[PDB]
A paper describes a structure:
TMEM16F, a member of the conserved TMEM16 family, plays a central role in the initiation of blood coagulation and the fusion of trophoblasts. The protein mediates passive ion and lipid transport in response to an increase in intracellular Ca2+. The protein is inactive under resting conditions and becomes activated in response to an increase of the intracellular Ca2+ concentration. Fungal TMEM16 structures have defined the general architecture of the family, where subunits, consisting of an N-terminal cytoplasmic domain followed by a membrane-inserted part composed of ten transmembrane helices (α1-10), assemble as homodimers.
To investigate whether equivalent conformational changes, as found for the mutant F518H, would also be observed in activating mutants that are located remote from the α4-α6 interface, we have determined the structure of the mutant N562A. This residue is located on α5 and does not line the predicted pore. Differences in both directions are found for mutations on α5, which constitutes the center of the subunit cavity. On this helix, point mutations of residues Asn 562 and Tyr 563 result in a two-fold decrease of the EC50, revealing two positions where sidechain truncations strongly destabilize the closed state. A dataset of the mutant in detergent, in presence of 2 mM Ca2+ and 0.01 mM of the lipid PIP2 (N562ACa), allowed a reconstruction of high quality, showing two populations of the protein obtained after a 3D variability analysis and refinement of the two end states. One population, containing 62% of the classified particles, displays C2 symmetry and was refined to 3.01 Å. It shows the protein in a non-conducting closed conformation (c) that is essentially identical to the structure of WTCa determined under equivalent conditions. The structure of the N562A mutant thus confirms that the rearrangement of the subunit cavity in F518HCa and F518HCaND is not a consequence of the disturbed interface of α-helices 4 and 6, but instead defines a structural transition towards the active state that is adopted upon Ca2+-binding. The absence of asymmetric conformations in datasets of F518H obtained under equivalent conditions further emphasizes the gradual stabilization of the active state, which is more pronounced in the case of the mutant of the residue on α4 than observed for N562A.
Numbering used by the authors:
A (entry chain A), B (entry chain B): 43 to 81, 87 to 149, 187 to 196, 202 to 223, 228 to 427, 445 to 488, 503 to 587, 591 to 640, ...
Write the structure that this text describes.
Amino acid sequence: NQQDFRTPEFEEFNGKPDSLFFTDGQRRIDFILVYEDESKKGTNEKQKRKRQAYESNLICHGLQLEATRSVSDDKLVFVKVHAPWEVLCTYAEIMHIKLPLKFEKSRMNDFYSFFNPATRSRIVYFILSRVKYQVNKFGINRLVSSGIYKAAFPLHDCRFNYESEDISCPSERYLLYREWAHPRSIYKKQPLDLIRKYYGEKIGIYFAWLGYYTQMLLLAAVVGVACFLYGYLDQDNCTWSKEVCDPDIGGQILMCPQCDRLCPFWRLNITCESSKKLCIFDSFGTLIFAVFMGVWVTLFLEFWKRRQAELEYEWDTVELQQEEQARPEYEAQCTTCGKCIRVTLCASAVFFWILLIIASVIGIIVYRLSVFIVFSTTLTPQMATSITASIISFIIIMILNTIYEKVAIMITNFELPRTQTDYENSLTMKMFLFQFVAYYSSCFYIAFFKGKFVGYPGDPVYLYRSEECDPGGCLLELTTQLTIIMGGKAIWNNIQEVLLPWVMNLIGRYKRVKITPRWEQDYHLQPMGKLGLFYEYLEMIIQFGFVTLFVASFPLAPLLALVNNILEIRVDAWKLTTQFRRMVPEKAQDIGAWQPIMQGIAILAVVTNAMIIAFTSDMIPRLVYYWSFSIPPYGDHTYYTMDGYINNTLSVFNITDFKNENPYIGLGNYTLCRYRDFRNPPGHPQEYKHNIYYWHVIAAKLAFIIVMEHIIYSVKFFISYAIPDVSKITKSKIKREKYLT
Amino acid sequence: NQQDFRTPEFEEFNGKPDSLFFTDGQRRIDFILVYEDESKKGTNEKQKRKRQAYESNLICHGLQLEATRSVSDDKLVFVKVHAPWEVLCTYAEIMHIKLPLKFEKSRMNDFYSFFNPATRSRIVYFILSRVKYQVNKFGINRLVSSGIYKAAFPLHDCRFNYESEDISCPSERYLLYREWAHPRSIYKKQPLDLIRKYYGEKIGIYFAWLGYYTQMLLLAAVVGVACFLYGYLDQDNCTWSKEVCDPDIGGQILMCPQCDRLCPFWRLNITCESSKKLCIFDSFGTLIFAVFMGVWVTLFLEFWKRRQAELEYEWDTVELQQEEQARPEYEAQCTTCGKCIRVTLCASAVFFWILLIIASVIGIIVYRLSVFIVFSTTLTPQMATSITASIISFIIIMILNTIYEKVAIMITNFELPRTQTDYENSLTMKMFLFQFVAYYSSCFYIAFFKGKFVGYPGDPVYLYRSEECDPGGCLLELTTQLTIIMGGKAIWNNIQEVLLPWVMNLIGRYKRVKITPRWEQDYHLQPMGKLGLFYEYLEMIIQFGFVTLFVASFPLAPLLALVNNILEIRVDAWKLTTQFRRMVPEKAQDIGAWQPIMQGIAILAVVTNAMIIAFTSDMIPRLVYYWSFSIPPYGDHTYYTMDGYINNTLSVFNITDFKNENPYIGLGNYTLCRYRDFRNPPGHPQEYKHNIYYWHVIAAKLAFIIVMEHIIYSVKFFISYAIPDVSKITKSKIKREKYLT
Ligand SMILES: CCCCCCCCCC(=O)OC[C@H](COP(=O)(O)OCC[N+](C)(C)C)OC(=O)CCCCCCCCC
Ligand SMILES: CCCCCCCCCC(=O)OC[C@H](COP(=O)(O)OCC[N+](C)(C)C)OC(=O)CCCCCCCCC
Ligand SMILES: [Ca+2]
Ligand SMILES: [Ca+2]
Ligand SMILES: [Ca+2]
Ligand SMILES: [Ca+2]
Ligand SMILES: [Ca+2]
Ligand SMILES: [Ca+2]
């Protein structure tokens, strides 16, 4: 318990470049602790005292340590840490590790190189965290946080690209780089058992979840492509789009200006090309695919639960949960009311940043309003404005995202979660809320609040001059925004993931920090961090939200996500294998709070899709016209039809503007202009007021919302009730295990 | 394992009337087995052989048996069964019973009359079920089912009304009859710990759940009475009801006949008294109470979960679940596809009975249509018809309920569930489905399908002549039906529960089957049955459905349920204590599938209340008129108001009937009659067609449904997320137990 003897067999050796064993080679390296001591104000002496005390306690606990001087930096010292068989057995009895038994699985010790390097490293890390050094001080995490130990990490088997020089060593890292984690193997299956063996249950479960997600996205994308091709082949029969394109009918419709000044009365001809591709995106194919996706999200969740149960059986992810140690930062600072006030203050700051991104969205709105005029003066101008606004909003969101990552780390540090699990949960909720708002605010605005509250040309709604939507609807604009944001986020995240660790390693090599041992080689790598796969999970959950929430706009979102996931598996695996220092294996029976987040997103997706179809799409007005306003009571046709829809939907407007300006007279010489609304024509007893057609349409929209929501929720409940969360084969295997044992 | 020696100390004694011990009095009675053997075709010999083998096996296992001849029936033999201390200890080690420890609680045996009579009986019953007698035969349940043993049951402490003759015996039954299970103690608290000690965890958890349910109903009823009194005090300001009552305005409205023949054109005056009491039942008070109940159901569920966790800690309801034995009926008969086909056939039969009760509802509809004419020819006739139909439907439902109980037992016997738990689950789902349909079909019809599809007087909707609703709405009729069904079911169930066991015991005494011992006294009692509190749970769940689903009609449903529960606690406790043979204690950590049923009812209640308020109540039309049709654009009043609502809502009808009969001319000499619909007046370009007012009203109804459902579901989610399911005190106690142990 005191610093008496530390660091035996202190001897420098680098002749063996690829070896995970000690100088004698009898016992392997389970951990590496990196420090430096030769080079003020007594701090060096204090750190030396504390480190010597910790090393003495470690050796007293039974571990074997051997330190070598770095061949490059004379001040760096690497301490290789190995655990004897007796220590491994006793600390595997302390924490109930399941081992192969004659391949049955059971508790602390079984009957049967016996411990894999991953579990050896896990046991050694548990010992390092438990052993005290000193008031009381707990373990190695506090030493690392205090700068006493520069690093502490396990070792990789070998170089990822080259086979290990040692022949008895199975080059698992090389195999995982060759048959995995490499674009050359982009098509092969994932060796989930092997990657679990090499990295741990957390990484294994993440990669299994990603693979299952890709598998389900394959089915969703196939069905979406089927619906999209149905809509594409029915393009020749778009009655309303053909009518818009027709100069005889759509050409004679003079739409009123959108802005007050310097915007001409424009004919509907300029909307022909956009209408052609819009008819594909708002059709019965997209409606059927929205219903199918409502079913498919439930299928995805249920089958992931079944796969998770299967993996819980096969990998034994359920271990006894020992009391989680308090974080060193929390324990350094140690009333309850004050900490509650601090939590409320942190939440206030987070909602302040949410208000900031909302203000950014409002700024984008103002940019659209200001730039439409210059686009018109100088590929219709409205489409160009929409595309440019989408690009600018995407860039602004991406720029804000990194700053929010930094300040979210700052905020979660300012508040004090005692355990790493509490830190992870708080960061999860905070980060997910901000990412949700930032990445979905513009899409939600385009879907639900763009063009909905504008009024008629007389007495328009001012904020100033709220955005008016296109006569065909804003579903095309929403689809463009979704494509831009989703594809750009995917590409940008992949580029950042590939480059940032690689660039950091390259600059580390350039700073000169030839033959070098394994501990040095792995030390010259970027640490993954205390969080781990948090950002990978967050990215995948954001992609899932994009796929599910706005699937009613275009059916190709599952296909885009499928391509993104096929690339994502390989990029994540490659960076984890090559560019990052090895992490201590953990145990995880699920994905964490991300699964409740996905369940909430699944519940919200039904409402979002129903409201998208009802409000942002013109399908309900078209159906209402076809079934009720082409018949004799309100129309002239003998049978149900869609012709005349454009002429009978748009409302007339004689030029009589309220003086509460009248810019139409200054902007043109025309007398009657048509606007996309369902108000009464001029000369009516109640002119410019909502009419029977408007109320019929809105009643149909609300009835569709109610019917779709209730039917889809009922079907989801029935499917969840019908599908058992545990597979029959897994049940049989569990019963066999219980019977044998 | 063979019948060699059975039934030691076979000696008849009845001198001690109140004693739970053997003839020597040293060891107590843990069980009683009743049989008879002296009195064909060799069956008596076969049963004698099997019973002797079972008794020999019982004695070999360590139990002590002593049989006495019945003092009344010479053929009846009672076998008292006692377990020695060693047998109790070994079979308490086999199944991990938690015992007091120095009062901490822990596993099979602790350090400290030691076993309560309840747990002694539970251990002895476990032994009886496990011991084999014989192909292989399992235990005592098969013998009882086969008629070998006439009965097998534990004993009560004493007579419920008289203190036990023995002085060392704590008369727990007498105490539980004096301070509980008695109307004289209708106001006192429930000794939950004492009743759990005497009966078991199942009975204890049921009574605790009932008490908590009553406690929450108290709050719900107080709030409902507040809202009801608000509506009652605002009765003097009901503008529309006062207008209806006014002969100057409501008296001049001539409503068209409802039936085709022999129904007069009737003035709205006859609706004045019903409108007066309807204004109380459809108001903002009832709306606010519906929202409050939406919150209150979530509060109820969350706090019941917290109370359940507290009881799990305090009573140790979580025991190790040994493998449940197969039912004797299932094991007597022992492919999978055939049994699946049988299950589908049984489900088809159940849905057939559901169709039968639906046909009964249709018959009630036909009865109303046929009897309104005779009521009019011979307390307005429509109200009299509604009340009589409610009474008849209630009687028919009650008559069908018992027959369905019998045939549901038959169906669950026809299908083969291997375990009693599977039997309980299947019977639960089947019985709950039928009870739901039977008790809610008429209410759902009145709420959602009565008067909704009738058309206008020209071209009315025929099935024939679907029921037309009152001008004020059918919320009053729904409230009357709810009051009738709920109160009648409560009274009828209480009367049946009180009388049926008591009547059976009385007729058993009358059939002569004076001083008698404890085993005979308890044998002359009605057995509870293998199900137990299944019907009590079902009754309470049906009452909960009545309270929650239709709470938007009248706010006094929680008060009625509160009175019913205050009576129900005492009646259930009294019958369980006095009229029923004692049951073996069980262990239960919750109420079972009834909790998922309650969660489903809670989810459905939001939709049901929103749709009730929107469709069956006139609040939405009144609000729409006030805010949009009393203003100059559609009305003449300068400010928002409600006057003129009756005259401006009802639609006119000139007498021009389609010849697709024309009975109006034969039934009266009038020319213009007003009907409750929002169609255009005669002479309009599109007359007798839905108008802008109708579409505005329906759009408002659907918007209200959407807004209310989404807001209430969001609030329920937030409340469930905010409330932790485990109380802080229970968490502290669990942490203290973990720290000490
Ligand atoms: C819960 C997460 C998602 C929430 C999304 C909320 C979206 C709300 C959208 C909304 O209220 O939009 C306005 C609607 C529909 O009016 P539209 O007929 O689409 O507007 C006409 C536009 N025009 C003048 C160019 C012809 O105007 C109405 O009359 C609709 C009133 C009913 C709203 C129901 C939604 C309430 C949700 C809580
Ligand atoms: C889920 C468990 C509960 C289900 C309850 C379903 C209730 C359906 C009721 C229904 O559709 O009723 C017809 C509605 C109401 O219009 P009303 O104005 O009440 O009908 C005319 C009545 N009058 C001639 C005497 C003036 O007329 C309409 O146009 C309503 C159409 C919108 C129906 C939305 C509900 C769909 C639920 C799945
Ligand atoms: Ca990526
Ligand atoms: Ca990633
Ligand atoms: Ca399921
Ligand atoms: Ca009752
Ligand atoms: Ca009862
Ligand atoms: Ca909760």
